[PDB]
């Protein structure tokens, strides 16, 4: 019901400052608290009462909230900082405990690469077969964090994406995949559909149609 | 010198019932508010339900009331969740963890959890659609269930060029993936191509000829 909501990545250089907000209606009236979680640990807090660090915890890691808005600090990345950050908090009531979406932050360990995108329609089998899906396949990107949004002709769509969570390849690098799945009717009746896929503030849009 | 370790999970059907266990030494048990915070495959962490030192107080999300039941025995050092009418949804890593004295530190340490997998025991094999065509071509392999399926082609001989991607879990409940790869578009005419798929599970087998 009650909801915190992150942004779901960030990248930063090692040695530099990286900010990640928890956004939600109650804390104006509660603490915020944030958590570390580094690939196939269980969690460890870092920040609790908006702003206080538990014994051990480097200095390095700060905090501070307002309103509805509280925000995790960490000035001068270390690669060992790279992990996934989740802020918590209670409901208005204190029923209820919530933790936002999590925050996967990236510390930049090898080269940048923008993702290669490959746009398949749906096979004449498949539609033959009264079902219509478009694949979206995107590789061999770093950092591993992407973003996809669909287009019919020009206009956003939302309904029947699915989209998997990116995958470390033999290389290093990512991989993931996104699918539209479209009645036969609707993907023949556009002039065009689109994958666009938004990695580190770029965006490659690859288009098909059907001929 | 703390420690916490949970118990108890394992693979079950849908409806069945499962009871973890979590053991606390290196500290006085007796005195803290406990957890269960749960966490499923590449997703977030969600409370599941907590209980306070003396069992005065206990709350549950509201994905789990009703169904699932916390407990302890402070004697006996040991948090308990019992899990009825178990749900596809309810599969994650379940933590154990714990509070400071007072709640000032919420879930200030942590076990390292126990995998409860819900999985119905029937099956769907694939449907598999050519991905057809310097180039790539590929298969989809879609709506089956469960987990997994393997892809080759030509029957192992080809391998260079090769990227099967892992599969997307639909809101169906349904898995599809696609396996590509990456050729000459000079030998399109000639090569045949095709891709093996394998889904143990639903004893199924198929070799699809991609075509242009
Ligand atoms: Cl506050």
């Known amino acids: 019901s009650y909801e915190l909501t992150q942004p779901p990545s960030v990248s930063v250089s090692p040695g530099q400052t990286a900010r990640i907000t928890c956004s939600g209606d109650?804390?104006?009236?509660?603490?915020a608290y944030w958590y570390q979680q580094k690939s196939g640990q269980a969690p460890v807090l870092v920040i609790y009462?908006?702003?206080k660090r538990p014994s051990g915890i480097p200095e390095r890691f700060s905090g501070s909230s307002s309103g509805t808005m509280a925000t995790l600090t960490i000035s001068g990345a270390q690669v060992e900082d790279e992990a996934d950050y989740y802020c918590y908090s209670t409901d208005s009531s204190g029923n209820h405990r919530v933790f936002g979406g999590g925050t996967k932050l990236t510390v930049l360990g090898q080269p940048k690469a923008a993702p290669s995108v490959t746009l398949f329609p749906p096979s004449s089998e498949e539609l033959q077969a009264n079902k219509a899906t478009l694949v979206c396949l995107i590789s061999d990107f770093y950092p591993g964090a992407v973003t996809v949004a669909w287009k019919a002709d020009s206009s956003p769509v939302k309904a029947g994406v699915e989209t998997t969570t990116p995958s470390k390849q033999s290389n290093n690098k990512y991989a993931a995949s996104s699918y539209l799945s479209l009645t036969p009717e609707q993907w023949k009746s556009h002039r065009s559909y689109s994958c666009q896929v938004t990695h580190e503030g770029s965006t490659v849009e690859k288009t098909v149609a059907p001929t | 010198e703390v420690q916490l370790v949970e118990s108890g999970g394992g693979l079950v059907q849908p409806g069945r019932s499962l009871r973890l266990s979590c053991a606390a030494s290196?500290?006085?048990?007796?005195?803290?508010?406990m957890h269960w915070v749960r966490q499923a495959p590449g997703k977030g962490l969600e409370w599941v339900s907590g209980i306070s030192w003396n069992s005065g107080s206990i709350g549950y999300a509201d994905s789990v009331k009703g169904r699932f039941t916390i407990s302890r025995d402070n004697a006996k050092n040991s948090l308990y969740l019992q899990m009825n009418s178990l749900r596809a949804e309810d599969t994650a890593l379940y933590y154990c963890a714990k509070d400071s004295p007072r709640g000032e530190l919420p879930f200030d340490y942590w076990g390292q959890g126990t995998l409860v997998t819900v999985s119905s025991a029937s099956t769907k094999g694939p449907s598999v659609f050519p991905l057809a065509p310097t180039a790539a071509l590929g298969c989809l392999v879609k709506d089956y269930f469960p987990e997994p399926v393997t892809v080759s082609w030509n029957s192992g001989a080809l391998t260079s060029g090769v990227h099967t991607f892992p599969a997307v879990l639909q809101s169906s409940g349904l898995y599809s993936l696609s396996s590509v790869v990456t050729v000459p578009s000079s030998s399109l005419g000639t090569q045949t191509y095709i891709c093996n798929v394998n889904h143990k599970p639903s004893n199924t087998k198929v070799d699809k000829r991609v075509e242009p």
């Open positions: 109650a804390l104006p009236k509660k603490y």
């Open positions: 290196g500290f006085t048990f007796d005195d803290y508010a």
């Open positions: 009462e908006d702003s």
